[PDB]
Design a protein around this ligand. Structure first.
Ligand SMILES: COc1cc(C(=O)NC2CCN(C)CC2)ccc1Nc1ncc2c(n1)N(C1CCCC1)CC(F)(F)C(=O)N2C
Ligand SMILES: [Zn+2]
Length: 294
């Protein structure tokens, strides 16, 4: 039958974890609230069964996710706190992001107010900067991969398609899997690089402001065509300041998009209100950002 242990023991560090509430199925994995029985400290447990890792291929991707994620630590990247295995499962101990992800927030709120976007996008961009500085391309940035903590801060996660750039000006040919906001130079298949993540962010931005993905069609393959044909509309009701930024990020030619270190310098940010923090109410009710209470 092959079920998951009630206590998850790491024989290496002698840390023991108590399998808490079930959070969901993040792909090949099942995810649980897990607490260290010593410090009582609470984490998210990514538990993936080895039965689904039978092929060395599926297996190397898991190892790469780990290898990459463990090397990273930044305010806007999901805290990676450890990993281990028994005979049947792989356990990964990650930062518990209690306010879920921008996906759930998007599904409750749809389109966001401009400062909220600015707020989030800034954080997305920063984490991503950290990644690119470390020669890491996420390659699968989407609302579901942008996790929110207690303070509504963005924590980039799931490095399942992440990759290290091993030398200057490398062009990665293969992408093993299918992202949401997948870049046109991936499908054009003459290589791809960092500018893929920028593209993704272009689509994230659009989505946050418009309330829907920029391409989203019935067919997946349908959606794939208009990506490489560059075919999307920006609604009238969207401010030009924002729309320009989006247009700059959603260019088919990768080398036209801004680098990650360029973005926060865009008019959209530099001449717009970026909140210092968000109210919790922002998960349900659009904030107006008043200047004084009553
Ligand atoms: C208490 O907090 C949560 C609550 C719920 C929550 O309320 N879930 C409800 C969903 C609907 N069911 C019916 C009830 C629980 C969901 C997620 C939480 N938190 C969380 N933190 C971190 C991660 C994460 N989640 N990821 C998500 C992806 C999808 C399934 C977990 C998986 C992950 F792999 F651990 C990961 O990498 N990260 C970065
Ligand atoms: Zn593959």
């Amino acid at each position: 039958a092959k079920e998951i242990p009630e206590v998850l023991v790491d024989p290496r560090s002698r840390r023991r974890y108590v399998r808490g509430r079930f959070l969901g199925k993040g792909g090949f994995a099942k995810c649980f609230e897990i607490s260290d029985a010593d410090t009582k400290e609470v984490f998210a447990g990514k538990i993936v069964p080895k039965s689904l890792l039978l092929k060395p291929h599926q297996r190397e991707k898991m190892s790469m996710e780990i290898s990459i994620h463990r090397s990273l630590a930044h305010q806007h990247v999901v805290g990676f706190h450890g990993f281990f295995e028994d005979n049947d499962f792989v356990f990964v101990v990650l930062e518990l992001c209690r306010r879920r992800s921008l996906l759930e927030l998007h599904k409750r709120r749809k389109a966001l107010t401009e400062p909220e976007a600015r707020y989030y996008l800034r954080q997305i961009v920063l984490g991503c900067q950290y990644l690119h500085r470390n020669r890491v391309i996420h390659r699968d940035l989407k609302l579901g991969n942008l996790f929110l903590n207690e303070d509504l801060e963005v924590k980039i996660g799931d490095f399942g398609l992440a990759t290290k750039v091993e030398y200057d000006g490398e062009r990665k040919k293969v992408l093993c899997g299918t992202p949401n906001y997948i870049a046109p130079e991936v499908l054009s298949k003459k290589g791809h690089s960092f500018e893929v993540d920028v593209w993704s962010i272009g689509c994230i931005m659009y989505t946050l402001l418009v309330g829907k993905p920029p391409f989203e069609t019935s067919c997946l393959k349908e959606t794939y065509l208009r990506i490489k044909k560059n075919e999307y509309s920006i609604p009238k009701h969207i401010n030009p300041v924002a729309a320009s930024l989006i247009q700059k990020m959603l260019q088919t030619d990768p080398t036209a998009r801004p680098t990650i270190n360029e973005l926060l310098n865009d008019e959209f940010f530099t001449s717009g209100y970026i909140p210092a923090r968000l109210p919790i109410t922002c998960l349900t009710i659009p904030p107006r950002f008043s200047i004084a209470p009553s």
